Structure 1
Amino acid sequence: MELITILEKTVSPDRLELEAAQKFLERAAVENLPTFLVELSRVLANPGNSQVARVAAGLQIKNSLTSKDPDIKAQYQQRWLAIDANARREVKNYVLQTLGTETYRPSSASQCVAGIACAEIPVNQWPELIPQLVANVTNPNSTEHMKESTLEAIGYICQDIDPEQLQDKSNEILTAIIQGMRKEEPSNNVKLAATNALLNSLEFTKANFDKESERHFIMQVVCEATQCPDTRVRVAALQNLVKIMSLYYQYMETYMGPALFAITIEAMKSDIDEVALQGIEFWSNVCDEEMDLAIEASEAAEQGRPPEHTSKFYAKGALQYLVPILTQTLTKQDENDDDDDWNPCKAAGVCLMLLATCCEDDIVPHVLPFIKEHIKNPDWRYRDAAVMAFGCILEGPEPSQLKPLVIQAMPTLIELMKDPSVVVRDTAAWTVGRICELLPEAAINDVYLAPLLQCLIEGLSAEPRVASNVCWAFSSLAEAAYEAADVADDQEEPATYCLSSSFELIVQKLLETTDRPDGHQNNLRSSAYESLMEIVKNSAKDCYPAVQKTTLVIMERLQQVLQMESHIQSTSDRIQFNDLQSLLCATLQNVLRKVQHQDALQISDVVMASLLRMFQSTAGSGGVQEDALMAVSTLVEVLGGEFLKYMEAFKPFLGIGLKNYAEYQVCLAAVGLVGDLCRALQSNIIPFCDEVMQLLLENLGNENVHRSVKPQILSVFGDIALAIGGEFKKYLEVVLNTLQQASQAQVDKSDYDMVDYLNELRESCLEAYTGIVQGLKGDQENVHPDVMLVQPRVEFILSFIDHIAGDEDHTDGVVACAAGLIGDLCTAFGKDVLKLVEARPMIHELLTEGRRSKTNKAKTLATWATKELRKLKNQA
């Protein structure tokens, strides 16, 4: 039956026809890919076919050739490259002739071309594509539709396919796109399609980007495009210019003066949202890359080397024009303001923040008059502008130069705190929160502290859109109280603080706002609790009964947590269920770290039962169960040697904990938790060591797990030896053989992430080797005979660090833990290793930078090692 009828049906509004057509298409493509694709290409190539059917065929071919999931794309490429070359060429010709025969504005065949080329180029089965497209572009007889279809296909090509496979054939494509970029083209559609294509292709223009003439011609083309009356071409050329800026900051100095900056400011001055927004985006990208180059210059200066790239302070020279227009457009707010939609106003705000970061102290004289004049205007627009600018420019200059202004303007700020206009109140709350976050010295002022604190205290009862902001302001005040309190009252712990004088007042109110029905709005429920963690943290010794009281309250929430296992009705409800558990589980460990051991004993029993049940109730959604076990671990870090009463009801829970083998995150803490048990249970884990150690090798054997977990298994390996001492003899011979392979594993220097991946991998190797050495050695007696079992392997380990000593990536941690081996082995053996180390000379230079390494822990192990050799040489 006619497949054109299928194409018509798969666009008509009927679910049954859609699913039936999709099933037929998939079944026939799987059964007979070549014939089906040939028939589809022949059908779509016919100009006389209905445009709807042609679009349907194009989208179906795109779906068959490409999809969202990368692995499905890869397997479909492998399926496609196995088709015989005759049908390949036939469909190539059919799709090539299809373009130019469609009245549709976008080319449905562009997606098909992209899909076929996706595996054509890597196998190089379609080398005539570039000359074919060049001829299509250069043909004078070519019509609008043919040109735009070719341009769209080229854009999809340069968008989807891996950039490396197009490296060799870039020059002619760039030549074709530039020849098709001539402004003499009467249709704007061709210009916009070419602009989309080139902007999506810039990732490999370096082949033709070097030439001065080509660069000038391309830039003149884009500059003339920026003058086109059509605004879509305006925005396309502006985005293209933005991406050039993001790519080639080195050379734009030759051209900033003539055209670029004038076009950018003209784009800003436009009343149209899009053009102005693109101008903001361009200048913000300039700002960000100026940050990156400033960072590079700082690294070069501290290193003494000349930086690879050099900046010229573009924003420093442009701020004099940037400030007034940005400030003016800051006032374009709307009464029915929203936050889900990006607007020119918030773009102006973020751009102003970035410019303030870049210019340091060169913004204050250029913005102070506006805020000073418009902080008191009767209309809320200009007051909003002034207060938001005052908040946004808060960073960049040193606090000392800003102190007089903030200290003399704070009364005005608490004045605008109270005005009935909601939007200005919201901005005022944000400003005071940020002013507390950045500079605390001005926030601490009893002349103003009590009135402003009271004001925000009643303000938190208002709508959530200000409640969340004022809650974070409370949190900011909390860590400010910390930072100025640990220096004010005592060092080991605060005894009594000024904010703490009203601590009982604020804390219960946070519970009230926690129970607000609108807590879901503006993340209020997650607002108080995060603020709650910090405010409970700032518990001076006089606040102890207060924090005991809220502790007496919190388990009731957990007692509540026991009792809605039947009200899970929606995924969002389950999501909110999942969200609530994560915060609550963090709450105890937040508060359990600042209580008394005796006070922890009574709550320990009820805590365990609550934690016992919830690990199994939520079998699915393991993300929250990640937070569970470290919360249980926190009990171990405080309960200590009284925790042994629960292992008999903990071992199966630990077993199922590591029984996932799918998610690394759960085992990430699981290997940590057992590592935490050793530092507390000490030698009492020996009966339980057999079960976990056997389980541990199983995770070692399974290679399906990620690579980042692998160092962690080595992390627990070292410490368990210390906990059990010499009992590790039974499993001793196993680990070195397993560790021999991982240590001997090596890779090239291509990807930095795996270079750092091996860095922590070798790092874990070193600490594990120390742990077994320390465990077999004992505590106070001489070297135990248990160390002889690893003696033959010490030379190979010395060779492993030799290769690491030859490595060039390096980090403070890598060298530091490296020093641990020599100190441990020298204590372990002494004479036996003196000759062994002397065979390798590169260790002597490795310790030289150890003395130079800035990290104290690096230095300590560095000096720990070197002094050990000295006594050994002088021993004999």
Structure 2
Amino acid sequence: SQYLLTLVQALANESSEGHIRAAAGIALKNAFSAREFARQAALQAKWLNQTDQETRTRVKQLALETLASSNSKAGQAAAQVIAAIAAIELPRNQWPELMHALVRNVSEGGQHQKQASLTAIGFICETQDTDLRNSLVGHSNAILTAVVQGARKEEPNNEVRFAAITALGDSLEFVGNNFKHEGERNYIMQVVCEATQAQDSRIQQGAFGCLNRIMALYYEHMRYYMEKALFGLTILGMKSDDEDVAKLAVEFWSTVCEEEIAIEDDNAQVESSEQMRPFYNFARVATNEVVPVLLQLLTKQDEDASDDEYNISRAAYQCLQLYAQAVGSTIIPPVIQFVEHNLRHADWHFRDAAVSAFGAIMDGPEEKVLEPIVKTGMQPLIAMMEDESIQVRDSTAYALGRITEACSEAIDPNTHLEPLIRSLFNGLMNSPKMAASCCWALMNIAERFAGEPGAAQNPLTPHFNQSVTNLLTVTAPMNGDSTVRTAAYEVLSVFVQNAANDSLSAVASLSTVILQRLEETLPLQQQVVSVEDKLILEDMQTSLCTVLQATVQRLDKEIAPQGDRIMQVLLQILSTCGGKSSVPEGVFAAISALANAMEEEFAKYMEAFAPFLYNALGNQEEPSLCSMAIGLVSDVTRSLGERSQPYCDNFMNYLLGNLRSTTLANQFKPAILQCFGDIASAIGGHFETYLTIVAQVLQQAATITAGPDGSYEMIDYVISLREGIMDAWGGIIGAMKTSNKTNVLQPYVESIFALLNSIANDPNRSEALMRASMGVIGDLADAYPNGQLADAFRQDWITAMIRETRSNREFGARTIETARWAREQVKRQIAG
């Protein structure tokens, strides 16, 4: 009380040093405000009640008068105090007209007084509060007209315009109403076009930033203001010698391409135009004026700049990608022009900018229009791998990889494929700095020239053994750069994945080599002492296990002689590994390949490997390994079939035990229920023992929902969850169907339909969920020939569900075919 008077009078007290005054007002706001929530309400009790009217009148008077104090600091804390008082009093229909007067202070008051006024408007508008803003919508008028008055050329101070645009930036957090009327919007867009005109850099920064958030806001009225001056204004700012202003000038079209991407990708989802969101096609119009500036900002570069710090060229490149993915093929015509100019240029800034540019536009534009020049200008581009500038060599490499990913067909094999390979290998084996791109490009070649399935040969085959030899060559050293080793093994794993049958024998020899190297790591496990040594050996073992997986998946059934040595070395690796390591995870991958390959022949490995699997299942403290263990349970049992039963009891105890959770959202549950499915399909009749419990859990799991609080998280969780439930019922019905025990499967069928209903009524659905849905439908048809399910089948939601399924073209083959099969099953089941 008297406390409050001494404080606020100290706030008004000019004779005291300004920092002390700031201490006084900051102390006073904190006598009634904090970032903390509930204590805020307590302080509000200290405002309204403990000290009822008191001087709150005199306090607010002293604060409003303190706004006019010469110090910015005095008006700093004064603005803070008014900012607090408003947050309590104005909604309560307290403080009224104390807001209206503030605008008059803005349009007529003193210069520092203007600082404190707009500073108050800023400090108030910064908060995100739906009821606060509910009472602030009524005051939004005075706020917007005020910030109009203050940002004016007519206004002298720059700092008042900083506070004005800052007031814009946090006021526009609230676009509620936002005055749909075009008049006020005209003055606003005028004062913002004005705001970008400032000779000052910093005012332009606030201007372009607020204009950015606004371009994320009222695009609707914006459509008309856009169509003339703004293009050349934006070009003027993009050309600015200023950096951070150039960065925000970039951030515009960054945001523009973002929202227009969202709309372009909502307009294909349209079934009818009422569904349509507005679209403005700002990009395709702007590009022919905007793009040349993007090249011009690419030629400029800074090697001295720290890596992964954003730069004008950097953001220009990223935004050029955004145009590339929104503007579509329409982006092409400027870019090629600038590439046509610069490709042979002496200055390396221009060559790097060249290939970075041509390496920017392959994505987005449709394939064949890309083909003719990519089929034409490619050869010099390979010739440019010999460039003096390793950075340019690097950018050429990534450009090459993008060409692979895009117009793979553009690479005529006989007259381009070999040189490109030799270039990427030599650049890998001699130039580590450009190595990673060379890897990525090569992986793409493998994916693109894999050839027809079952093929005796693929385009890669002649280059294959030389490739494997080169990769084993670069991976050979124990002191090679860890990154180049890893990437080289990854590219190798990909050539192995994508290889012709004629090369299988070669891959077989390769597999032996991998095992050999894996075995050799085990003594190396012992030589480790530095932590770096641990990271290297773990990454090394991880890479070898991965490539080994590739060999096993491709060799398929031919891997059998290798299998003993494989399980021996891998199980030895498990015994020596421990803790946060990626190794065991990769080892289960390789074992998983060996199990799917050997299938029932794997069963001899189960007696020794089972404990490792159990142990991986029992430790949630290794979530990724536990998940890998569950998936591997599914793999083992699906491959061994009936053989896997004795193990299945222990498998079920680890799965069912893993269902126990203190969190409703068990992250393993979808995988576990799915594993129930796979276990069911494999076992058949003996799954009956588990049926009483499994069904319970499935009946449980169906009840789970994201609720009205719908994170993308919880939604996707429920979706994958029900994918697990349907996979589970599918396998269980199949097992019951082949066990002559459908009668015990009788009770749960109504719950199954209830789930199908729950899914059909849900907009949020996955393709796989619908595939499994269809399959469970038909499985139910085969399960119950009697036709007593027909009266359950005949309901509209079933038929509309199946038809909505098969009708959709977005889904792949498997799903729609299952839908056809299901519908035939249903129509047949209508009578019997």
TM-score by length of 1: 0.80
The residue aligned with 1:276 is 246
Q: Distance in 2 between matches of 1:578 and 1:291?
A: 41
What is the Cα deviation at residue 159 of structure 1?
5.1
Identity of aligned residues (%): 34
Residue type at the aligned position of 1:791:
Q
**Which whole-Å CA distance do the structure 2 matches of 1:389 and 1:646 have between them?**
54
SS in 1 for 2:168: helix
Judging changes above 3 Å, is the alpha-carbon distance between structure 1 residues 862 and 190 closer, same or farther for their aligned structure 2 residues? same
Confirm or deny that 1:674 pairs with 2:633: yes
For 2:423 and 2:705, the matched residues in 1 are separated by 62
Match of residue 534 from structure 1: 494
TM-aligned CA deviation for residue 637 of structure 1: 1.5
Cα separation, 2, equivalents of 1:832 and 1:616: 59
Does residue 458 of structure 2 align to residue 503 of structure 1? no
Describe the superposition over 1:555-599 as per-residue Cα deviations: whole angstroms up to 9, x where unpaired: 3443354334674644x7665566555444322222221225454
Q: 1:297 aligns with which of 267, 275, 288?
A: 267
Native 8 Å contact 1:411 1:448 kept in 2? yes
> Match for residue 208 of structure 1?
178
Name 1:405's counterpart in structure 2: 373
Q: What is the one-letter code of the residue matched to 1:139?
A: N
Q: Which moved more, 1:233-242 or 1:272-281?
A: 272-281
Contact kept? 1:316, 1:359, Cα under 8 Å: yes
Aligned residue number for residue 323 of structure 2: 355
Assess if the C-alpha contact under 8 Å between 2:79 and 2:116 holds in 1: no
Which runs of no fewer than 5 residues in structure 2 stay unpaired? none
Counterpart AA for 1:847: I
The answer as to whether partners of 2:552 and 2:559 remain within 8 angstroms in 1 is no
Deviation at 1:232, TM superposition (A): 0.4
Query: Hey, what does 2:197 align to over in structure 1?
Result: 227
Aligned to 1:848: 803
Deviation at 1:440, TM superposition (A): 2.3
Query: How do residues 204-603 of structure 1 correspond to structure 2 at under 5 angstroms?
Result: 204-300=174-270, 303-305=271-273, 308-334=276-302, 336=304, 339-482=307-450, 485-486=451-452, 491-495=453-457, 497=458, 499-514=460-475, 523-562=483-522, 563-564=524-525, 567=528, 569-570=530-531, 579-595=539-555, 597-603=557-563
Checking the alignment, whether the CA contact within 8 Å between 1:360 and 1:397 is kept in structure 2 is yes
Q: What is the distance in 1 between the residues matched to 2:617 and 2:325?
A: 46
Note the alpha carbon deviations across 1:667-721, whole angstroms, 9 max, x for none: 4333322222221232343333333323433333424263554333321223323
| Other-structure match for 1:834 | 789
User: Mind listing any 5+ residue stretches in structure 1 that lack a counterpart?
Assistant: 1-35, 67-72
Letter of the structure 2 residue corresponding to residue 867 of structure 1: E
Q: Distance in 2 between matches of 1:58 and 1:427?
A: 53
CA contact (8 A) 2:736 2:745 kept: no
> Is 1:861 aligned to 2:818, yes or no?
yes
**Partners in 1 of 2:568 and 2:25 — Cα distance?**
61
Describe the superposition over 1:401-451 as per-residue Cα deviations: whole angstroms up to 9, x where unpaired. Answer: 344433333343344332323333333333333333322233234344444
| Aligned match for 1:818, one of 768, 773, 783 | 773
The alpha carbon displacement at 1:636 in A equals: 1.9
Contact 2:348 2:392 in 1 (8 A): yes
Structure 2 residue identity aligned to 1:422? I
Q: Does the residue aligned with 2:659 lie in a helix, a strand or coil?
A: helix
* Separation of aligned partners in 1, 2:4 and 2:218: 42
Alignment of 1:45-124 (within 5 A): 48=16, 51=19, 77-78=37-38, 81=41, 85-86=45-46
CA shift in 2, pair 1:249/1:470, >3 Å: same
- Supply the distance in 2 between the matched residues of 1:150 and 1:380 (Cα, whole angstroms): 52
Alignment deviations for residues 179-222 of structure 1 (CA, whole Å, 9 cap, x no partner): 14512554322322332343244332123242333323332232
> Residue deviations 1:527-567, cap 9 Å, x none?
22222221232333343343334333323443354334674
Note the C-alpha offset of 1:77: 2.9
Question: Are 1:464 and 1:518, in contact at CA under 8 Å, matched by a contact in 2?
Answer: no
| Partners of 1:44 and 1:649 in 2: CA distance | 79
Is the partner of 1:408 in helix, strand or coil? Answer: coil
Instruction: Give RMSD over aligned pairs.
Output: 4.5
TM-score w.r.t. structure 2 length? Answer: 0.84
2:157 — aligned with what? 187
Which one of 766, 769, 774 corresponds to residue 734 of structure 2? Answer: 774
Q: Is the 8 A contact 2:402 2:441 kept in 1?
A: yes
d(CA) in 1 for partners of 2:705 and 2:598?
A: 42
For residue 256 of structure 1, report the CA deviation from its aligned partner: 1.1
Residue 169 (str. 1) matches residue 136 (str. 2): yes
CA distance in 2, matches of 1:111, 1:661: 53
Counterpart-to-counterpart distance in 2, 1:649 and 1:59: 70
Taking the aligned partners of 1:652 and 1:130, their CA distance within structure 2 comes to 74
SS of corresponding position for 2:663: coil
Deviates more, 1:150-159 or 1:345-354: 150-159
User: Bigger shift: 280-289 or 354-363?
Assistant: 354-363
Matched AA of 2:136: K
Q: Take 2:578 and 2:5, find their aligned partners in 1: how far apart are those partners?
A: 52
Q: CA deviation at 1:83?
A: 6.2
Q: Residue 601 of structure 2 aligns with which residue?
A: 642
